[PDB]
Write a protein that binds this ligand. Structure first.
Ligand SMILES: Cc1cc2nc3c(=O)[nH]c(=O)nc-3n(C[C@H](O)[C@H](O)[C@H](O)COP(=O)(O)O)c2cc1C
Ligand SMILES: Cc1cc2nc3c(=O)[nH]c(=O)nc-3n(C[C@H](O)[C@H](O)[C@H](O)COP(=O)(O)O)c2cc1C
Lengths: 178, 178
């Protein structure tokens, strides 16, 4: 097993991939934007808190700070092209609001085709190096009827997985319950 | 598409799964513990920062606060049984240090068999509801040659995935690069 001491950013920072990209939806007045975020994680069960790490370089960063409300939606493999397209262009150069979406209960935009989505109120924002963590409280839930299993778990093979640097995949259908 | 307002903890909080479980290794004096953490994410590229969200109920939590150093290791689907075991029992009841492991450059314990691992210096801890986010700086990197690709991602299909509530999988073999 090879090793090295870190001396700055890693030659690839992909060791913990793949991950499910969360699609971050945000609205400020008429303007809707979407941004995939693979740097995402649950943060608390009670209360339900979910976080997304967003670079201050993203158009989405300013919109979140203004809106203080956002969606995180989770999309099937079949939407790989759309998710990659949302993550390869900025709202500085393209109205990604033209992407098919709807407004949730709190008025946050939610990208269409998702098997699940959270509406979130922004609770806190924390800077860690070159990204800011946006901590949202889940205030509403959208779920596709039957793309989730008995305990609320997305069905094997369905989820879009991101491997980093524009490489995508999906879970295998085989599961293990040891 | 079904929806509801959040009224406390969610019936299932698995909408964003599967994820790669990071195995969190920690050492205090002669005592070594491990803890899988599916709530994990990259937090910064420059500098390289990585977070794990750990409940104050975990034996690991106090050890992390004392040691200020830990590992995060990433394991192949073959080690599904070991990873599940480590997150099914507490260091309060069983010496998990007995799991085969080595010490890293900075003396953190790294569980054997990982395709990759970080040695981390603890930078910050933040409370978000019922879990604490431990923000580590990657100070060293371990890689299993030939299990990672050209850019550093684990080879297609190798990663252990966790679906929540004791269910596991792996990524599909096929990858797609739009
Ligand atoms: C699959 C995928 C995952 C991504 N994950 C993140 C992320 O976690 N945080 C982030 O700041 N950018 C991430 N990006 C980059 C942004 O999505 C990308 O810069 C996007 O064009 C930003 O659009 P915006 O400027 O309209 O906000 C990701 C991109 C892709 C394709
Ligand atoms: C796959 C898996 C992922 C887990 N993810 C987390 C996590 O992100 N944060 C956490 O606090 N516990 C998590 N747990 C629970 C701990 O791993 C479990 O409570 C473990 O027994 C803690 O051991 P400890 O008391 O020695 O720290 C997870 C468990 C499993 C099996």
């Amino acid at each position: 097993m090879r090793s090295y001491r870190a001396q700055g950013p890693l030659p690839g920072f992909y060791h913990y991939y793949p991950g499910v990209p969360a699609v971050v939806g945000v609205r400020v007045e008429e303007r809707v934007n979407f941004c995939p975020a693979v740097w995402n994680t649950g943060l608390s069960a009670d209360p339900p808190l979910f976080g997304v790490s967003i670079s201050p370089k993203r158009f989405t960063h300013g919109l979140l700070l203004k809106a203080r409300r956002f969606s995180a939606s989770f999309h099937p493999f079949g939407q790989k092209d759309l998710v990659h397209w949302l993550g390869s262009h900025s709202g500085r150069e393209v109205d990604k609001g033209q992407a098919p979406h709807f407004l949730g209960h709190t008025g946050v935009p939610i990208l269409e085709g998702a098997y699940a989505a959270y509406e979130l109120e922004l609770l806190e924002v924390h800077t860690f190096g070159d990204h800011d963590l946006f901590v949202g409280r889940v205030v509403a839930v959208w779920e596709e009827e039957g793309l989730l299993d008995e305990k609320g778990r997305p069905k094997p093979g369905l989820a879009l997985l991101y491997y980093g640097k524009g490489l995508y995949g999906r879970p295998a259908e085989e599961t293990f319950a040891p």
